[PDB]
Amino acid sequence: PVWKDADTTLFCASDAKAYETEVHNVWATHACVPTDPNPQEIHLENVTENFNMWKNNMVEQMHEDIISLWDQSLQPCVKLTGGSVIKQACPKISFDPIPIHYCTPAGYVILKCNDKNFNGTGPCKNVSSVQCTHGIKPVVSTQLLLNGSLAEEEIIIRSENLTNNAKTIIVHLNKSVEINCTRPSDIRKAYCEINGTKWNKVLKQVTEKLKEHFNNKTIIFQPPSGGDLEITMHSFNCRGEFFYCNTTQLFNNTCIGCNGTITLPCKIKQIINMWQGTGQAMYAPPIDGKINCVSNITGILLTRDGGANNTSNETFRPGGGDMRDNWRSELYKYKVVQIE
Ligand SMILES: NCCNC(=O)N1CCC[C@H](C(=O)Nc2ccc(Cl)c(F)c2)C1
Ligand SMILES: *[C@@H]1O[C@H](CO)[C@@H](O)[C@H](O)[C@H]1NC(C)=O
Ligand SMILES: *[C@@H]1O[C@H](CO)[C@@H](O)[C@H](O)[C@H]1NC(C)=O
Ligand SMILES: *[C@@H]1O[C@H](CO)[C@@H](O)[C@H](O)[C@H]1NC(C)=O
Ligand SMILES: *[C@@H]1O[C@H](CO)[C@@H](O)[C@H](O)[C@H]1NC(C)=O
Ligand SMILES: *[C@@H]1O[C@H](CO)[C@@H](O)[C@H](O)[C@H]1NC(C)=O
Ligand SMILES: *[C@@H]1O[C@H](CO)[C@@H](O)[C@H](O)[C@H]1NC(C)=O
Ligand SMILES: *[C@@H]1O[C@H](CO)[C@@H](O)[C@H](O)[C@H]1NC(C)=O
Ligand SMILES: *[C@@H]1O[C@H](CO)[C@@H](O)[C@H](O)[C@H]1NC(C)=O
Ligand SMILES: *[C@@H]1O[C@H](CO)[C@@H](O)[C@H](O)[C@H]1NC(C)=O
Ligand SMILES: *[C@@H]1O[C@H](CO)[C@@H](O)[C@H](O)[C@H]1NC(C)=O
């Protein structure tokens, strides 16, 4: 057939258990339809489509949905919002992101890039066409992208413009790294155990890959030097508890006696700078007992340092804050068009 680049309102789908008390299931149970029981994907032969992950409206729409999900599902005791302040009940909630499918209404279709080393921008020569994206888990975090998909070939570097150092860099890993984070039975004391062996290996590979994009220059990793706790640390939510974990051991250029298990120190903060921008909020103290999540690190968000134009090296620090980049990391291979 034929089509034309177009933006329209998408709808969502899920496998939300209607009996579930969990907040992602509850939101999906009443804001999304059931997943396509017979999903039909059909490859388009001799067709080349130009995709642009950084200028894609599916990002902004999914981002809209996640603010909605969080605003109805999270119960802070007090919300400080731009001069207003609201007290409330803050019961414990059950939190565990479920995949969400995004789907075009009639008159529109979703194009999907299957070029395996597609970097997100430019043309794609193996294009399919779907009614619905795949199941995307909306995991909220900084620096480390958790529980996502992997690049099926090489490690991929994505940025709207690598020459601009204000542009976030998204590295898509081809090998997942486990991050196992516990708060066992100070109650906010917590920690993350990562296999230093595997981690160091793939960071060297990132290093390798990054050097390609930077004329063989020297690649150096550093901790963030400026920003709120949420972006200077690895922030994420595990079972309703906001985790803040120190990344300094995972970005030491020493090991790019150090192959055991890295133990990142962590704190469970009750007062957080909300990622939606609204302000700052307070929550109740953590649950009794063992609070643990085992996640897959599938990508890394990084920022290059400015002012290295005639310098010997390039400096990269873990990044985050704009969580459209997180949706970016899974919606890059997709584009919405209207059948003409
Ligand atoms: N390049 C964009 C700059 N980003 C920015 O200015 N923000 C405003 C202040 C910090 C905000 C934040 O990231 N919050 C947060 C909360 C909970 C979790 Cl779990 C998490 F992963 C993150 C983001
Ligand atoms: C196109 O992508 C499909 C699905 O990812 C995969 O089988 C292969 O890489 C490509 N197939 C052809 C015929 O080009
Ligand atoms: C992505 O690929 C396009 C060519 O399709 C190229 O113009 C662009 O520089 C590449 N970007 C990165 C970050 O590799
Ligand atoms: C972690 O990664 C493996 C493959 O590396 C995958 O099979 C598994 O489902 C992933 N776990 C989660 C929770 O996504
Ligand atoms: C991941 O990509 C790197 C190149 O970036 C490659 O050397 C390595 O073999 C890949 N690993 C896997 C498991 O695909
Ligand atoms: C990328 O960023 C640099 C520096 O901000 C800018 O000079 C340039 O115009 C941008 N785009 C390209 C294609 O280089
Ligand atoms: C995660 O760590 C805890 C304590 O550090 C341990 O009991 C548990 O077996 C670990 N789980 C995995 C999957 O490694
Ligand atoms: C670290 O990961 C490697 C795989 O590369 C594996 O040999 C080992 O199980 C892991 N380390 C520990 C202490 O379990
Ligand atoms: C960058 O270094 C690699 C090292 O393997 C070399 O092969 C390559 O020639 C260098 N750069 C360019 C632009 O060729
Ligand atoms: C992370 O830990 C290092 C020491 O290991 C410390 O110097 C640094 O201040 C910590 N980061 C933050 C944001 O506090
Ligand atoms: C990643 O997925 C696993 C398995 O579904 C889950 O236990 C864990 O909480 C997830 N991690 C995050 C940060 O949501």
Author numbering: 43 to 124, 198 to 300, 325 to 355, 357 to 396, 409 to 492
What text comes from the article?
The HIV-1 envelope glycoproteins (Env) undergo conformational changes upon interaction of the gp120 exterior glycoprotein with the CD4 receptor. CD4-induced (CD4i) conformational changes in the gp120 inner domain involve three flexible topological layers (layers 1, 2, and 3).
To better understand the structural basis for the role of the LM, HS, and HT mutations in reshaping the Phe43 cavity and in CD4mc binding, we solved the crystal structures of the CRF01_AE 93TH057 gp120 extended core (gp12093TH057 coree) containing the LM+HS changes in complex with two CD4mc compounds: MCG-IV-210 and BNM-III-170. Its structure resembles that of the NBD-556 analogs, but it has a shorter amide linker and an N-substituted piperidine ring. The buried surface area (BSA) measurements of the complexes were 678 Å2 (243 Å2 from gp120 and 435 Å2 from the compound) and 699 Å2 (252 Å2 from gp120 and 447 Å2 from the compound) for the complexes of LM+HS gp12093TH057 coree–MCG-IV-210 and LM+HT gp12093TH057 coree–MCG-IV-210, respectively, indicating that more surface was buried by the LM+HT variant. In addition, while the orientations of MCG-IV-210 in the binding pocket of both complexes were identical, the shapes of the pockets differed.
